[PDB]
Amino acid sequence: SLQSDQLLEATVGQFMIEADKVAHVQVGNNLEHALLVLTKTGYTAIPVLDPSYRLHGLIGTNMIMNSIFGLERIEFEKLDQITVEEVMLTDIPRLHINDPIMKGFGMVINNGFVCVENDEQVFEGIFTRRVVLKELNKHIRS
Amino acid sequence: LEATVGQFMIEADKVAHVQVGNNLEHALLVLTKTGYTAIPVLDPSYRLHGLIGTNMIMNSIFGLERIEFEKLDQITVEEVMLTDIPRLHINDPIMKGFGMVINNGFVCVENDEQVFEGIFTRRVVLKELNKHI
């Protein structure tokens, strides 16, 4: 939809995957629910929102397993005792729909995907390494 | 550009791996402690046999209203690992590796003996594409 000479002036929002196509979980859900959504959907991490649909963090299976790998056994009972808010990653920089695409491009170096929000922290979608690679590979060819 | 995969791959001795014959609980533990979502499975000859991944393991123990963690140390990685994986050579052009990491977090590099040499990752490609543009 965009030619090569338009790519570098686009915004993050024009290439993000929209929120209604991304499974998410809630800060108050337990880890078993998060693990089921991660396993069923097959994502490396999943957005964590509050009830107002606002973005709080990211949770992945490695975070969940780290909290239940116990001394002598896997303590699976803790999946029903710990909430995603206690385990999620919160130290991700925030990315906005109107931010220039290069800001997204730099952020996905260290982060597999970044959740995108608007100016009220409402979750709008995700910006991924694959999105960047898929679009860049199209334009390096041309 | 004119660069090769080998010039930017992460060398094999820097990459976490497990062995054929190891059980899924050990694989899951290595994946968890290292933060990887998939890691190579090697044999005693350092040859690449496949990739074992966190979602692969979880899906194999998705049981009746519960996750069957007790099965993990009784199932070996070779029963669950992905063997239909792309592979690169050290002299492959970087644009060839670029194309292969669109749909793969990383791609393993190996020589003609299938000896594992390293991995070519999305992160390294993006880090270099940052400077090219």
Q: How far apart are CA B64 and CA B87, in angstroms?
A: 37
Joined tokens for residue A42: 């097959």
Contact A109 B123 (CB under 8 A): yes
- DSSP H helices in chain A: 4-7, 31-41, 61-68, 84-87, 101-107, 129-141
Smallest CA-to-CA distance from A38 within B54, B122, B105, B101 is with B54
- Among partner residues B33, B69, B129, which is closest to A136 by beta-carbon distance? B129
Q: Say how many C-beta atoms besides its own lie within 10 A of residue A76's C-beta.
A: 17
CA–CA separation, A124 vs A67, rounded Å?
29
Chain A residues within 8 angstroms (CB to CB) of chain B: 8, 32, 35, 38-40, 42, 44, 60-62, 65-66, 69, 74, 76, 79, 105-106, 108-110, 112, 129-130, 132-134, 136-137, 140
* Least Cα separation, residue B4 to chain A (angstroms): 16
C-alpha distances out from residue B102 to A39, A55, A133, B30, B54, Å: 22, 27, 6, 25, 20
Encode B23-51: b = buried (16+ Cβ within 10 Å), e = exposed.
bbbbbbbbbbeeebbbbbbbeeeeebbbb
A114: its two tokens: 């970044």
Nearest Cβ partner of B67 from A35, A66, A133?
A35
Residues of A in contact with B67 (CB under 8 A): 32, 35, 39, 76, 79
Looking at residue A124, the DSSP 8-state letter turns out to be: E
The Cα of A14 is separated from the nearest Cα of chain B by a number of Å equal to: 19
Range of the domain at A125: 1-142
Contacts of A134 in chain B (CB under 8 A): 102
**First CA to last CA distance, chain B:** 12
Say how many domains are in chain A: 1
Cα distance between residue B127 and residue A125, in whole Å: 23
DSSP label at A107?
H
The residue with tokens 């239909």 is B84
Distances (CA, A) of A120 to A15, A94, A103, A115, B21: 20, 12, 19, 14, 51
Whole-number Å distance between alpha carbons of A32 and B67: 9
Residue A130 burial (CB count, 10 A): 18
The rounded distance, in Å, linking the Cα atoms of A12 and A120 is 16
Three-state SS letters, chain B? CCCECCCCCEEHHHCCCEECCCEHHHHHHHHHHHCCCEEEEECCCCEEEEEEEHHHHHHHCECCCCECHHHHHHCEHHHCCECCCCEECCCCEHHHHHHHCCCCCEEEEECCCCEEEEEEEHHHHHHHHHHHC
User: Can you tell me whether residue A142 is helix, strand or coil?
Assistant: coil
Structure tokens belonging to residue A90? 């919160």
Helix H segments across A69-128?
84-87, 101-107
Q: B65: left (phi > 0), else alpha (psi -120 to 50), else beta?
A: left
Burial class (CB in 10 A: 0-12, 13-18, 19+), A142: exposed
User: Using the beta-carbon criterion (under 8 Å), do B102 and A134 form an inter-chain contact?
Assistant: yes
Separation between Cα atoms, residue B93 and residue B6, nearest integer Å? 9
Query: Is residue B121 within 8 Å of residue B105, measured between CB atoms?
Result: yes
How far apart, in whole angstroms, are the C-alpha atoms of residue B91 and residue B73?
39
Q: Identify how the structure was determined.
A: X-ray
